[PDB]
Amino acid sequence: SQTQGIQQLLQAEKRAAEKVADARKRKARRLKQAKEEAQMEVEQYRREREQEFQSKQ
């Protein structure tokens, strides 16, 4: 363990850090997607209410 065992522990902690970084990046991308897609849904329903506004006119 003096050479390779401690290295295995260290690189396993590196893999844990890699997983944490991946999950953080996934969360950030997920929320940017959330912003964009929700803006698109609001835009679509906005088109719907525009057309209904013309109909009311």
């Binding site: 363990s1 003096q2 065992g5 401690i6 522990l9 260290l10 902690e13």
Partner: protein, 109 residues
């Protein structure tokens, strides 16, 4: 003080869960330590039996084990005539004291 004795190569670097205790062990029990170092605490690094220095009463040596296993090591090792020397190593932390003593002598002069 252990300024000139223990160095950075004698300590684990960037340890994740491993503390390298400076377990000084007398000549009366040095071989007992070098053949029990791993079983002296739970979750000890195998074959981490290293020897660093000595003195008039005992032979310094260190083993690498788990963080929570420091207390278990102390429990199982204080009764074996072993002793733990918790010391922190740095470059100027060790040299500044000799600088201060020498400066004290020179300005006193």
């Amino acid at each position: 003080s252990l300024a000139e004795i223990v160095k950075k190569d004698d300590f684990v670097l960037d340890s994740e869960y491993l503390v390298t205790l400076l377990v000084v062990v007398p000549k009366l029990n040095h071989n007992d330590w070098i053949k029990q170092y791993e079983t002296l605490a739970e979750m000890v690094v195998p074959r981490s039996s290293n020897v660093l220095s000595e003195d008039q009463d005992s032979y310094l040596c260190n083993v690498t084990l788990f963080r929570k296993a420091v207390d278990d090591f102390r429990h199982k090792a204080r009764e074996n005539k072993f002793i733990v020397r918790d010391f922190q190593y740095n470059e100027e932390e060790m040299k500044a004291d000799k600088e201060e003593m020498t400066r004290l002598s020179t300005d006193k002069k």
